[PDB]
């Protein structure tokens, strides 16, 4: 926790000369307003003004005027005078928070969750990213930084070790890193965080993306969180381990049952499974995202839960006690953390307050099953394209309630425009298959 | 489109 | 009409030394068995044997044994000893026609149509194609053969005039050419045929494709019937002008009404409009086909009929008398002519025997209409992707009746496999939009 | 534009 | 796939 | 193969 | 003629990876005097017991003459599943890749198709081996095993061997090993040809096995 005096003292002792008022749009892009430190007082008075229509992304029409209210607890100084940042909420000219801000939407969802008796919603993300080599002109190429495998010690100790430098710089910034390892695909890396509250977790995800993209550039590399940059190899996921807490106590933990899962946890996973098709578009917002959702690369392709499976939509880790959690594996690093977390929490709460019955967990004898038999059993498939994902999202009320009308409509319009632009392109695959056979 | 400038990524 | 003696005389006088027994598969590819003229007698005895599983295309599993029965009326000698061809039907070892042959399926559909009182189903196609330049290695490039426009006199008289040579060679072969012109897009050409009976029309379409591809290669060019080879320009269509006849008389002509359309014609177009989503996959079988079905390039995008509109699904030409016809504009040159014609005829007959009421024709005040208002009025949209087109095809019974169970199942399997292979590719558009923004 | 295909020379 | 040889165009 | 992603070195 | 057209014609069994190889399927028929010995004009199937004995004999010694019918190292790169080339010892009238296929033709044109032969094999030696195997089956009155049908596609090698379907040799080394244990192939070839072929193929395999392939350099040299 920090106050105005703490911020002034930090600026004075550390010789901060640049301030970044950081926020996000509906597309998850990290936006910021730069300010000289001489404006610090005006920053602390919630008097900084900016467009505000930038939150709409590329579907903005008219310039507005909106205020930035910083959150003093998010203060941190970058290790690269010095540059400091503050994460700000967006307020309208009438003093009320802007309804199109994902952070405010997540805060509202958490506030309405608190009326159900639960106090905290902890999130631990597992973001995976790719590192590509840069050419002479400084553009990213398609060559990977290394050639390692799952949990390999590929970038050994000497010469780049970009993952190690990222971890150390995050630790110096005040982050809580659990572990890091090489991912399955060559040049793919994963860094895991300790669990934190929802807003702090999403802020940490945004800051982690920014820090990774900066440090990779420092090492003459390019870091990408694209869900499926390369065909034929594993994609990048951002699995969300979530847990509910109502007062110094995990609500998912059953200390008597040998399974160790409370009926609340079963209701939560039933609700997440029920509305999985509804929030697929939000959790997988890119056209490329659905190129990751293909069988054989551990990404979930149908709606099921298990404790031990190759690619379940929901996984329950073996940990128990205060660390029992539910893992949603459909989220990709390109998704907006606030919106995806709000959608998942709303689906879980919808399952909780409807007392839904969780279906039977899947096990090894589902690998030999076609889609017809899978649907006969009751396992639905995730949407395969962004078009069909938007179609499914337009038919779900829980996602609309989670996002709010403004964010829901803007996201639908943006994604419809993006898909419309994508669908008219003639791909190289079409020119290879046709133009000689037809 | 009215917001041609904001859609420059797609064109 | 020809008999065995006529074929022997033609072989003897013209010094035919090579025979091509020509047929087609479910994908519309022109297949053939080559034979020396010394086998001519064995050809005329319906004793030539071949695999027959090649009709299945790329989903064939086991090699079969099937007989070729030539149709002597299709005899023609190519102007390039000499080479002659005969179009053959495929028969099983039990003496009955193979149910997977599109030509036999179209013949069966026509035979069942003849029980309704109609005697002939005449088709005039409007196939459009593109001509691309070849490089030094002989591969096709993306440069067009000319730079003309709609009805332009671009390839004037001297140096290639590939369209003129194609028309003259087709005329020498015994075809009936109506007119030819330059198409809207640069390097795009169209040659129109006089109307003929259904089987003869489809055979002429296949022979026209073969002749165009041969002559373009003669002129150091590459001819393609790909629906949308280039983004941002017009695609290629194969509009079908169809007319029904019950005995020396057009069944669509009303000599008393000012409009001049019989109620039979209205029922036919109502039936075609009703099942338009059903046969879209057959008439647009490629993934690239649905890149042509985008607004602004005269290709139909929704289900409507008109006498004067930019892109109606069904157009009624101003001609009357014995030449009154109904034009279906959704067909592309990559479609199998037999299967598409059978589907269109079955939809029309379904409309006829159900006495369906044709909806109101569309006019100029539909251009300013969103999809919501269009659907409120009653105008449905054509499927936008091959995946959704297959989804719609699986829900239509008329298309299944038109195709037969074998052809229906094989086509669905082939197109599902093709779409599955297409959907896992990472396009250059995705790499341009993402990998730097995410 | 409605006639995008006919205006391809300008785009 | 059983018919790998017939699907060589896609692979 | 079910574990296609783990056999990417061979394909 | 290919050289006339500025092209190169090759009968290599498997010149390209990932596409179909080239075969030289042999349709053979026995005749004893203006009459096909494989044709049965009374049975519905239309196959004489002589034909069944012939195919049983060919199936029995298939491992013996595999080296002669597939004499190159590259030949066994064609004998891989998925490209219609036979991989195990079985016969059928309708199957994707049976070792022996019986075409539906009857009368004087009834024949037995051996599909393991590739165009690189010596026609005389392969034909002699096939004829000797068929005659060995004929004069021993062997019983042909049951033909295979569509429900063999879902079968591992263990279940296939439990049923009784043997596998063809997968390498030229193992093919020579199998050929050295068969007496019918030696009788077909004669001692001189048998010994010379074995020596030549052993030398060829010895030269091939010591080469370091580019596949090894791609898989290893960075992982190890
Ligand atoms: N096994 C892993 O942790 C990798 C997961 C995989 N990258 C995915 O997209 O989900
Ligand atoms: N105006 C024309 O005749 C061209 C039609 C256009 N090529 C289409 O795809 O339908
Ligand atoms: N289907 C065919 O006739 C091809 C056979 C395949 N080329 C083989 O090696 O046997
Ligand atoms: Mg991982
Ligand atoms: Mg995980
Ligand atoms: Mg035209
Ligand atoms: Mg027309
Ligand atoms: Mg054969």
Residue numbers in the entry:
A (entry chain O), C (entry chain C): 5 to 84, 89 to 446
B (entry chain D), D (entry chain Q), E (entry chain P), F (entry chain E): 1 to 11
G (entry chain F): 223 to 446
Sentences reproduced from the published study:
To ascertain if this is a conserved mechanism among FBI-GS-GlnR complexes and to elucidate, in detail, the molecular mechanism by which low G + C Gram-positive FBI-GS proteins bind GlnR, we utilized single-particle cryo-electron microscopy (cryo-EM) and solved high-resolution structures of the Bs (1.96 Å), Lm (2.61 Å), Pp (2.07-2.28 Å), and Sa (2.15 Å) FBI-GS-GlnR C-tail complexes. Notably, the Bs and Lm GS proteins in the complexes were all tetradecameric, while the Pp GS in the complex formed 10% tetradecamers and 90% dodecamers and the GS in the Sa FBI-GS-GlnR structure was all dodecameric. D Density for GlnR peptide and contacts with GS in the Sa FBI-GS-GlnR complex (map contoured at 0.15 σ). Peptide density was evident for 8-10 residues of the GlnR C-tails from Pp (IQGELSRF), Sa (PINRGDLSRF), and Bs (FRQGDMSRF), and 5 GlnR C-terminal residues (QLPRF), in the Lm complex. These GlnR C-tails all form a distorted helix and bind within the GS active sites. In the FBI-GS-GlnR structures, each GS pore binds two closely juxtaposed but non-interacting GlnR C-tails as each pore contains two active sites, one from each ring. The GlnR C-tails in all but the Lm structure contains a glycine at the N-terminal region of the bound peptide (XG(E/D)XSRF). This glycine binds proximal to the E flap, allowing its amide nitrogen to H bond with the carbonyl oxygen of the GS glycine residue in the E flap. The GlnR arginine of this motif makes contact with residues on α15´´ and stacks with the side chain of the aromatic residue in the GS D50´ loop in the Pp, Sa, and Bs structures. The flexible connection between these domains would thus be minimally comprised of ~30 residues (calculated as the number of residues between the first and last residues visible in the Sa GS-GlnR and Sa GlnR structures; the Bs and Lm disordered linkers are >40 residues), which if fully extended could span >90 Å.
In Gram-positive bacteria, nitrogen homeostasis is controlled by an operon encoding glutamine synthetase (GS), a dodecameric machine that assimilates ammonium into glutamine, and the GlnR repressor. GlnR detects nitrogen excess indirectly by binding glutamine-feedback-inhibited-GS (FBI-GS), which activates its transcription-repression function. GS generates glutamine from glutamate, ATP, and ammonium by a mechanism that involves the initial phosphorylation of the γ-carboxyl group of glutamate by ATP and the subsequent incorporation of ammonium. The structures show FBI-GS binds the GlnR C-terminal domain within its active-site cavity, juxtaposing two GlnR monomers to form a DNA-binding-competent GlnR dimer.
